[PDB]
Design a protein around this motif. Structure first.
Motif, PDB file in Angstrom:
ATOM      1  N   UNK A 192     -13.551 -53.858 -25.165  1.00 25.14           N
ATOM      2  CA  UNK A 192     -13.750 -53.486 -26.551  1.00 25.14           C
ATOM      3  C   UNK A 192     -12.517 -52.908 -27.215  1.00 25.14           C
ATOM      4  N   UNK A 193     -12.718 -52.013 -28.183  1.00 29.68           N
ATOM      5  CA  UNK A 193     -11.628 -51.444 -28.965  1.00 29.68           C
ATOM      6  C   UNK A 193     -11.270 -50.024 -28.529  1.00 29.68           C
ATOM      7  N   UNK A 194     -11.388 -49.733 -27.232  1.00 29.37           N
ATOM      8  CA  UNK A 194     -10.966 -48.455 -26.652  1.00 29.37           C
ATOM      9  C   UNK A 194     -11.695 -47.279 -27.308  1.00 29.37           C
ATOM     10  N   UNK A 195     -13.013 -47.255 -27.121  1.00 29.84           N
ATOM     11  CA  UNK A 195     -13.851 -46.185 -27.640  1.00 29.84           C
ATOM     12  C   UNK A 195     -14.954 -45.871 -26.640  1.00 29.84           C
ATOM     13  N   UNK A 196     -15.536 -44.678 -26.789  1.00 28.76           N
ATOM     14  CA  UNK A 196     -16.580 -44.234 -25.872  1.00 28.76           C
ATOM     15  C   UNK A 196     -17.830 -45.103 -25.959  1.00 28.76           C
ATOM     16  N   UNK A 197     -18.083 -45.704 -27.122  1.00 34.27           N
ATOM     17  CA  UNK A 197     -19.266 -46.500 -27.445  1.00 34.27           C
ATOM     18  C   UNK A 197     -20.537 -45.658 -27.496  1.00 34.27           C
ATOM     19  N   UNK A 198     -20.456 -44.359 -27.210  1.00 31.95           N
ATOM     20  CA  UNK A 198     -21.586 -43.450 -27.337  1.00 31.95           C
ATOM     21  C   UNK A 198     -21.394 -42.404 -28.422  1.00 31.95           C
ATOM     22  N   UNK A 199     -20.173 -41.895 -28.587  1.00 30.16           N
ATOM     23  CA  UNK A 199     -19.859 -40.920 -29.618  1.00 30.16           C
ATOM     24  C   UNK A 199     -18.814 -41.402 -30.617  1.00 30.16           C
ATOM     25  N   UNK A 200     -18.088 -42.482 -30.312  1.00 34.86           N
ATOM     26  CA  UNK A 200     -17.229 -43.195 -31.255  1.00 34.86           C
ATOM     27  C   UNK A 200     -15.976 -42.415 -31.633  1.00 34.86           C
ATOM     28  N   UNK A 201     -15.862 -41.167 -31.183  1.00 39.23           N
ATOM     29  CA  UNK A 201     -14.783 -40.295 -31.617  1.00 39.23           C
ATOM     30  C   UNK A 201     -13.910 -39.795 -30.476  1.00 39.23           C
ATOM     31  N   UNK A 202     -14.152 -40.237 -29.246  1.00 38.72           N
ATOM     32  CA  UNK A 202     -13.385 -39.800 -28.085  1.00 38.72           C
ATOM     33  C   UNK A 202     -12.681 -41.007 -27.478  1.00 38.72           C
ATOM     34  N   UNK A 203     -11.359 -41.083 -27.664  1.00 39.80           N
ATOM     35  CA  UNK A 203     -10.530 -42.123 -27.046  1.00 39.80           C
ATOM     36  C   UNK A 203      -9.360 -41.430 -26.351  1.00 39.80           C
ATOM     37  N   UNK A 204      -9.629 -40.888 -25.164  1.00 38.80           N
ATOM     38  CA  UNK A 204      -8.621 -40.202 -24.357  1.00 38.80           C
ATOM     39  C   UNK A 204      -8.967 -40.439 -22.896  1.00 38.80           C
ATOM     40  N   UNK A 205      -8.063 -41.097 -22.168  1.00 32.64           N
ATOM     41  CA  UNK A 205      -8.212 -41.418 -20.743  1.00 32.64           C
ATOM     42  C   UNK A 205      -9.647 -41.823 -20.412  1.00 32.64           C
ATOM     43  N   UNK A 206     -10.101 -42.872 -21.093  1.00 33.99           N
ATOM     44  CA  UNK A 206     -11.473 -43.333 -20.978  1.00 33.99           C
ATOM     45  C   UNK A 206     -11.689 -44.060 -19.652  1.00 33.99           C
ATOM     46  N   UNK A 207     -12.958 -44.320 -19.343  1.00 30.75           N
ATOM     47  CA  UNK A 207     -13.360 -44.967 -18.099  1.00 30.75           C
ATOM     48  C   UNK A 207     -14.138 -46.230 -18.438  1.00 30.75           C
ATOM     49  N   UNK A 208     -13.824 -47.318 -17.740  1.00 32.56           N
ATOM     50  CA  UNK A 208     -14.476 -48.596 -17.993  1.00 32.56           C
ATOM     51  C   UNK A 208     -15.805 -48.675 -17.253  1.00 32.56           C
ATOM     52  N   UNK A 209     -16.855 -49.059 -17.975  1.00 33.12           N
ATOM     53  CA  UNK A 209     -18.180 -49.289 -17.409  1.00 33.12           C
ATOM     54  C   UNK A 209     -18.445 -50.785 -17.268  1.00 33.12           C
ATOM     55  N   UNK A 210     -17.387 -51.540 -16.957  1.00 36.02           N
ATOM     56  CA  UNK A 210     -17.416 -52.986 -16.761  1.00 36.02           C
ATOM     57  C   UNK A 210     -17.683 -53.730 -18.068  1.00 36.02           C
ATOM     58  N   UNK A 211     -17.956 -52.992 -19.146  1.00 38.00           N
ATOM     59  CA  UNK A 211     -18.146 -53.604 -20.458  1.00 38.00           C
ATOM     60  C   UNK A 211     -17.505 -52.837 -21.606  1.00 38.00           C
ATOM     61  N   UNK A 212     -17.150 -51.570 -21.441  1.00 42.03           N
ATOM     62  CA  UNK A 212     -16.683 -50.761 -22.559  1.00 42.03           C
ATOM     63  C   UNK A 212     -15.710 -49.709 -22.031  1.00 42.03           C
ATOM     64  N   UNK A 213     -15.465 -48.677 -22.836  1.00 46.18           N
ATOM     65  CA  UNK A 213     -14.504 -47.633 -22.507  1.00 46.18           C
ATOM     66  C   UNK A 213     -15.162 -46.260 -22.566  1.00 46.18           C
ATOM     67  N   UNK A 214     -16.312 -46.122 -21.908  1.00 47.61           N
ATOM     68  CA  UNK A 214     -17.039 -44.858 -21.868  1.00 47.61           C
ATOM     69  C   UNK A 214     -16.122 -43.702 -21.482  1.00 47.61           C
ATOM     70  N   UNK A 215     -16.321 -42.555 -22.130  1.00 46.20           N
ATOM     71  CA  UNK A 215     -15.455 -41.402 -21.926  1.00 46.20           C
ATOM     72  C   UNK A 215     -15.886 -40.642 -20.673  1.00 46.20           C
ATOM     73  N   UNK A 216     -15.381 -39.417 -20.521  1.00 41.47           N
ATOM     74  CA  UNK A 216     -15.635 -38.634 -19.316  1.00 41.47           C
ATOM     75  C   UNK A 216     -16.953 -37.868 -19.404  1.00 41.47           C
TER      76      UNK A 216
END
Ligand code: ZN
Ligand code: ZN
Lengths: 48, 49, 48
Positions: free
Chosen positions: B3-27
């Motif tokens: 995706x576009x390097x976002x948490x996909x849950x809160x939309x406002x956290x893009x810092x050293x994110x973690x991939x859930x095989x589909x997105x960039x979920x945060x910590x």
């Protein structure tokens, strides 16, 4: 109808705008929805 | 491509994110959803470790 | 309702899609009230 980008009596261009908007939202582009106030009572036939 | 390097849950956290095989979920969202259950609830896939 | 769903400092957007959908469906409750011109003369006067 000779034109392309306008979508009022053309469902194909409407679907094109829909998928473009969906792809932009999925990618993260700048989406701006502009509604205009008093479109009817302001325009004049002299402009046309 | 992901995706576009976002948490996909809160939309406002893009810092050293973690991939859930589909997105960039945060910590913190990842930790919360792991403490909740074993599912992901946003992609319906087994959560990473 | 809007405050209870939107307020919060840090843990207020754990699932923002669900919150947005709920708030949108709540705001769209205006379609329940019908639109049958409570008064005709007043509506005509306001239109004029
Ligand atoms: Zn997050
Ligand atoms: Zn996920």
């Amino acid at each position: 109808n000779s034109m392309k980008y306008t979508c009022l009596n053309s469902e194909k261009e409407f679907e094109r705008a829909i998928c473009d908007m969906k792809m932009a939202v999925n990618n993260g582009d700048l989406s701006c929805s502009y509604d205009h106030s008093k479109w009817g009572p302001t325009m004049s036939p002299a402009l046309f | 491509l992901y995706g576009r390097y976002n948490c996909k849950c809160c939309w406002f956290a893009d810092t050293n994110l973690i991939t859930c095989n589909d997105h960039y979920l945060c910590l913190r969202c990842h930790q919360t959803m792991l403490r909740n259950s074993e599912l992901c609830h946003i992609c319906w896939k087994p959560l990473p470790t | 309702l809007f405050i209870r769903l939107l307020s919060g400092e840090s843990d207020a957007s754990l699932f923002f899609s669900r919150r947005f959908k709920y708030l949108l469906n709540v705001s769209y409750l205006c379609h329940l009230i019908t639109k049958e011109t409570p008064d005709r003369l007043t509506d005509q006067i306001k239109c004029f």
